[PDB]
Amino acid sequence: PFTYSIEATRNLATTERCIQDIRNAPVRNRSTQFQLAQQNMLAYTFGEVIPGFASAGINGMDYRDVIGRPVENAVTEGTHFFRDDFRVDSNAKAKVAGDIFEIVSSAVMWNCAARWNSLMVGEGWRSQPRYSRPTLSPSPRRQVAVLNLPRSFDWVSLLVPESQEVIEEFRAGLRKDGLGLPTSTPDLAVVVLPEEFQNDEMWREEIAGLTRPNQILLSGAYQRLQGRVQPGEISLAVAFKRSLRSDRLYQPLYEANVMQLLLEGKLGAPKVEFEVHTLAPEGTNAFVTYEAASLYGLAEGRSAVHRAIRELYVPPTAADLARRFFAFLNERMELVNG
Partner DNA sequence: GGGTCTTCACACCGGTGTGAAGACCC
CA distance 224 to 226: 6
Is-contact 159 109, C-beta < 8 A?
no
Which window, 20-28, 119-127, 132-140, 224-232, contacts a second copy (CB under 8 A)?
20-28
What is the footprint of a second copy within residues 256-315 (CB under 8 A)? Answer: 257-258, 261, 265, 283, 288-289, 291-293, 295-300, 302, 305, 307
Name the binder of 157 from Mg ion, a second copy, DNA, none, CB < 5-8 A by kind.
none
CA distance 225 to 143: 14
Least gap, CB of 59 to DNA (angstroms) = 7
Closest CA to 230 of 159, 164, 166: 159
CA distance 171 to 164: 11
Q: Is 244 in the site for a second copy (CB under 8 A)?
A: no
The answer to the question of whether 287 is labelled as a binding residue is no
CA distance 33 to 25: 9
CA distance 282 to 311: 16
Say which residues have a Cβ less than 8 Å from residue 10's Cβ, sequence separation at least 6.
Answer: none
Q: What is the DSSP letter of 229?
A: B
Least gap, CB of 98 to DNA (angstroms) = 2
Q: Is 241 in the site for Mg ion (CB under 5 A)?
A: yes
Name the site residues for DNA (rule: CB under 7 A): 27-33, 35-40, 56-57, 60, 88-99, 101-102, 125, 127-133, 150-152, 184-185, 187, 219, 240-243, 245-248, 280, 282-286, 289, 323
The answer to the question of whether 84 is labelled as a binding residue is no
Q: Which residue is nearest to Mg ion (CB)?
A: 241
CA distance 271 to 204: 28
CA distance 23 to 30: 11
State whether residue 263 is helix, strand or coil: coil
Length of the chain measured in residues: 338
Alpha helix stretches (DSSP H) within the chain? 8-11, 38-45, 56-59, 63-66, 69-81, 92-120, 161-174, 213-216, 253-262, 286-289, 319-332
The answer to the question of whether 273 is labelled as a binding residue is no
What is the footprint of a second copy within residues 105-164 (CB under 8 A)? Answer: none
Q: Nearer Cβ to a second copy, position 35 or 143?
A: 35
Which window, 58-66, 99-107, 113-121, 223-231, contacts a second copy (CB under 8 A)?
58-66
CA distance 210 to 183: 29
Give the footprint of Mg ion on this chain (CB under 5 A): 241
Binding residues: 89, 102, 148-149, 152, 187, 240
Give the footprint of a second copy on this chain (CB under 8 A): 1-3, 5-7, 10, 22-29, 31, 33, 48-49, 54-58, 60-61, 82-85, 89-91, 173-174, 177-182, 184, 247-248, 250-251, 253-254, 257-258, 261, 265, 283, 288-289, 291-293, 295-300, 302, 305, 307
